[PDB]
From a paper:
The underlying channels, termed volume-regulated anion channels (VRACs) have variable selectivity and conductance between cells, but are similarly activated by osmotic stimuli and blocked by small molecule anionic inhibitors including [name] (4-[(2-Butyl-6,7-dichloro-2-cyclopentyl-2,3-dihydro-1-oxo-1H-inden-5-yl)oxy]butanoic acid). [name] forms a 565 kDa, homohexameric channel with each monomer consisting of (from extracellular to intracellular side) an extracellular cap, four transmembrane spanning helices TM1-4, a linker region, and a LRR domain. Here, we report structures of the homohexameric [name] channel embedded in lipid nanodiscs in the presence and absence of the inhibitor [name] determined by cryo-electron microscopy. The N-terminal arginine residue of this helix (R103) projects in towards the conduction axis to form the highly electropositive selectivity filter of the anion-selective channel.
Author numbering:
A (entry chain E), B (entry chain F), C (entry chain A), D (entry chain B), E (entry chain C), F (entry chain D): 15 to 68, 92 to 174, 236 to 404
């Protein structure tokens, strides 16, 4: 609904990034179940579990059918291949859904969605107010507004809940980024084209060690190296937020910059949880606060009462 | 329709969980009919239905074509493989559709949908009522409302039907969870990569026992271990409900907390099935009851009659 | 359109059942054209068209290529396999479309859709009628309603057509259920995994008899055993209907239960085809008849005329 | 748009039939390009281009690779297979699109869509007319209607164009049905499972004659035998139309059955092309003519003029 | 938007033809990337790059594996096959998109879309005009219309731009048709089933010449022969247009046929680019001009001024 | 929303081009993951890593199975094939998304979307203004408009931000085009059908060098040669823009061409960032400026004040 203004500039970049993070999780995923087979050949000559080396030349005959090649692929794809290479597309999906759903969980929990639901309502109407024109430079209906916003100020003034949740979201969408890099940089070298496996199934095929190949290992390094670069730019967004979300100390509002402009001084600072909801709407666009900066002044209420 | 308020906080978490439970039933299902073949090799040397064990090495030749390998796969996939491994994706779909449809069956049965249909109607209007402003702090049209809600109170006051059905839903969406864990934890070890089969078809192939492999056995342990963890968190939701749905004993309402605020005392407790429909809307958000806490007071009716 | 009230409780269960009956006809169908191949091996040793029986063991060599195996599969899938196993998904689709379309054919035939089209119209307005409030406890516009419903009573009072068609639908949606069970229970044992075929093509392959396998035979027994259980529960719905649709003998209406409540006695029973359209709307919810139980009373017409 | 009334009962059945005719053309078509391969084996022993006939038995070795089998399939699928078996799904699509598009071409040609566009307009308003209530039993605005329909009668009264086109549609949607049966019954026996081909490519494979198999030949007989039965029932619809479209001889209208009911006699028969547009709307439902049977009577115009 | 009237009868046929032209470009295209492989066999005996010719018979053994057959297919499909056979589905798509997009480019270029945007606006209102009723047989608001259309006549009267573009479209959608036939008839014989190739890769396979087969060559002759017949019927549409678009010489309008009917003579011919926009709307349906044939007459303006 | 007028003619062509650029990135991409295999044969005779050259002829036998051919394909597709041939479809997608998203980023950044959001609003209303009719040839409500646009002129008059961003977009959507041609023309010759590889895996297969083939190399030259031609035509669009975006020097507006027409001279030039938003709407269509050319004249304000 009408929550576009409620999202600052930095949380607009993030909503697009958290999609393209998902696009390379379904594209890498459909490409990993349809395919991501392994090819595997035995090594006749071997030295310590390593394929050492060996008129016109001719092929080598291992005397193996197709099902023995297809059996050893599954073994050397299940056992001697890192779980990160096989599950990378399913894993970035699980994480980006968290990074995404955490943002919107603050809009679904009814203890907090209700407070947002009517706060943006009274600001959206106050923006369109003929009296704000005169103050910036059948009134009894407009008096009920003054009593509404006076009630809605005294209704939400007991404690912080949305400033608690929205502070949790940027506390937990930074730890994840700090957790992602802990494992996604430490396990990307595990994926690689050339794979050697040794699985002890001599009884079936006749060989010990099998050199193998993972053809999509190169295409997953690209997505992974494109993913984590699509997550530090994400992480740089949320870092400046907490730099901005604690330096300001916005437990209350500061109307001191407009009280000179209106020259009324009958408008006091709002105590808690009415500032913060207002503080980011001014960070979105600074007009919507100065038109709401008049409904709290009793002189303006008096001039409206006339 | 306008039933969002009618769903408490715990039944909001559940509607999302009952989707992702389904997403891993269609994804595991398309991946089980397209594929989930079995590979199978015979074991030349065997000791009690068990593949015991056995210059440069060379392959083993079983002298089998492709159709004999493709025939024994079907046999050892039909007979010597547990039904739970093959039907897991179809089974969680059947169950999550029950877990899902049971929630909404209370909205379709016309004996009960009708009662919900107009109860939320009179609350949605009473929320938007100018007279509630004065009481919280051409009236003949508003008098018809007082007679409507007095009639609608005496119309629904005979017995409990929605409190019967909505009590059935959380009685039967707990037994299922208790039934799921009885079988889904006891049969997940049945699925496994390495499979040995012995099916007595020597007349066709020439061998008795065949070692086999199920490559998706690892991918189904993950979904199953992800599913049941996506069902105890579900089950923890419905457990607190019955803790909450019996401790309160909400056969009637308790207006005693607002009768001090209004200071009217002309508003009596509603007898049965008008409280419970109101009791969870107050559990959703506690405003919608205090604005409906005035239309029952005859002094307020008298002041409205003026 | 506004026909939801026009459908009793039992025909609400049925509309969902007639979908899931279709879901296992398209899922079983896409799975039967994409696949449902047969595997087939010859039997070197045979006794009366039956594969009798026969250091380390070795494979048996039939000296057949892939195209001879692929040719004999088509033969033993076309000739020695029951049509019910191959066409089950296409057959339940054909039947559920009949079971489904018969329900809605009563809404498309213009001789009967027209009568339904305005009957529900005059009831939907009469439900919202201020005069019904006073009777339950610029009138000239409401007089035209009294003349409309008096005309619409004398307009539809000649014979039964919707009571004829809606009686046909539950006469023909019971015979089908009785026809389904006659063949679907008598032919489900025909589908089975192990198949033996004998097709007399020695000239091409060299063998007489071929043991075969149908890997989806187990997955079709499940859908079939799930289907017919999804059709007797359907059939139990329509059985109670005719128990209810003949015991009542609703050729006319019985207003005798409300004539005490209104205490007017100026409202006579409606003769034919105006009761039945009204009789099931009262079976849906019993309010919509008692508000329509006043527009037929000439005293109420007189009090409205004042 | 509002053209539902303009379509009689028989052209309602037809719109559904002309869909399911198409559903078995896309289903038979996707199933014919994805697959509909041919299998082909050579016949070592042959007598006049016919595969005559021929301890434990053993396979026959033709000494052919896979590409020689795959080459001869294309030849014996291109040359020795009837075009009707390969193109049946594309052919019923081409025909059902004609059967379908011909119906709606009468709504697109602007010389005739315009006439339909305002004729249904003046009937749709006249149906909702308070004056029709009194006649069936600020008027100057209603006078303009009388002059509108008098003008719209004299505007469309010169000749027949929609009665020409709609007569063409049922002249050409009967000849096609008569053309379909001429070829679709005479060529269905051409499709059959067992196929023998002889193509003179000894230089490549080494054989003259090849027995073959067409596995979908049985599934196309079913659709074809289901299609033509889905076209004679179609053809039976359009046959009764011309029985009905010529027996009536509806070059003009006959208001003689209502002139007794109104007892005005100031309403004359409409000459041409205003009757036929009205004649089928009465065949849809007979109410819409008797309410339009008053706007042409000058006494009614006079009583409206008062 | 409301541009349906703005399209004559001939440009209505064309919009459907330019779809079915596209339907056989995506159907022929999906069928050409999924498949359209080539089969290729070597010719042991050859005379001048031509496969000349050559108890019970036996197969010929070329001693080739599957990858040598799969390598020579790509070569003889890339080199010795005409580009028209491989790219026909992609080529008719490119052309039909031009034939299609050129029609609608006249609606997107803002220099001309603006002129169309308000011309149809003033005609759509003037069609619904009570004063046209009297002339065909609070007026100050209608005076502004007379001044609007007098202004909109003097606003668009300087030169021809839409008559320039719409003349370009039928100049360039005839040259293409004349270009299509120049190449599509001269290259359809290139596609054919039997293909002989000779590619000089003896070093890999061992043979010089390879007979091949293109199984879809017959299905592309049908679409091509169906396509070009679906483009001359298109081309016959645009030919009559220029016969009609130059014979008339519609640089201005001719109101001489209605000036007798109105008998006013105060309505002069519109100079340029107001006639042509009006000339084709009369060619669509001749009513919309005679109702617009009154707003230009100063006597009608005078009678409206009264 | 209502931003169609805000986009000049050249940025309308571009929005379509930036789609078809994407259509050949998803079509080339689905065709590159589904397929784009490589075929590879060894060369028995070789001279310096080059396959030199070599009764009836017979095939060459390399004594290789299918898995050795399938292993060497992956190697010679991963190592000896240019990254541009494999990643071309993924690369044009990444670039066209930038070319596309950069255009619309100027509409999402809230510091600039807000300014556009109300500028087009006041022009869209002023276009529909009765007073503009008189000037081109309850007014207190129209006075508020004059004060609104006087305020909205003094509100946006401090600096340039949208003229900064929209200047950045055409500075960065020209450098990319200049960067595309730097690499896309220099790397298209890398893709080619015939490929020779040499990868040093003698230990597994037995050969050193393998001739290979890339069958889609011809289909990617076409898309690439079609792509870059679909990007210079794009690049020609943005080049004329900067020719037009600097020659005009539109830091302010020039009302001198209309001040003769109105003959008021009370309308001064707008200083900065109100001209440019207006300058391109006049470049779209020159009407919307002359109707907005009156609300700034105090004589017109005075005549409106009367
Ligand atoms: C005698 C060995 C050399 C010839 C081949 C070689 C040895 C094994 C393969 C090549 C040809 C072939 C083709 C086959 O079918 C291909 C299915 C692939 C698909 O489904 O795409 C099968 Cl089964 C077999 Cl046994 C065989 C052979 O005897």
């Amino acid at each position: 609904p009408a929550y576009r203004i409620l999202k600052p500039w930095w949380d607009v970049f993030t909503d697009y990034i958290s999609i393209v993070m998902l696009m390379i999780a379904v594209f890498g995923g459909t490409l990993q179940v349809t395919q991501d087979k392994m090819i595997c050949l035995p090594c006749k000559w071997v030295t310590k579990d390593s394929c050492n080396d060996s008129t016109g030349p001719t092929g080598i005959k291992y005397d193996l059918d197709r099902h023995q090649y297809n059996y050893v692929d599954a073994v050397c794809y299940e056992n001697r291949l890192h779980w990160f290479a096989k599950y990378f597309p399913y894993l970035v999906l699980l994480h980006t859904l968290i990074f995404l759903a955490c943002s919107n969980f603050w809009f679904k929990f009814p203890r907090t969605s209700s407070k947002l639901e009517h706060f943006v309502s009274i600001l959206l109407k106050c923006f369109d107010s003929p009296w704000t024109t005169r103050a910036l430079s059948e009134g009894e209906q407009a008096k009920a507004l003054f009593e509404k916003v006076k009630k809605f100020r005294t209704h939400v003034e007991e404690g912080d809940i949305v400033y608690r949740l929205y502070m949790r979201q940027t506390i937990i969408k930074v730890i994840k980024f700090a957790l992602i890099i802990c494992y996604t940089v430490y396990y990307v070298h595990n994926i690689k084209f050339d794979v050697d496996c040794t699985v002890d199934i001599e009884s079936l095929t006749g060989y010990r060690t099998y050199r193998c190949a993972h053809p999509l290992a190169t295409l997953f390094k690209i997505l992974a190296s494109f993913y984590i670069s699509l997550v530090i730019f994400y992480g740089l967004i949320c870092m400046y937020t907490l730099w901005w979300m604690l330096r300001r100390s916005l437990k209350k509002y500061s109307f001191e910059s407009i009280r000179e402009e209106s020259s009324y001084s009958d408008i006091p600072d709002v105590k808690n949880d009415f500032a913060f909801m207002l503080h980011l709407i001014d960070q979105y666009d600074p007009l919507y606060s100065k038109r709401f900066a008049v409904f709290l002044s009793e002189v303006s209420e008096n001039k409206l009462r006339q």
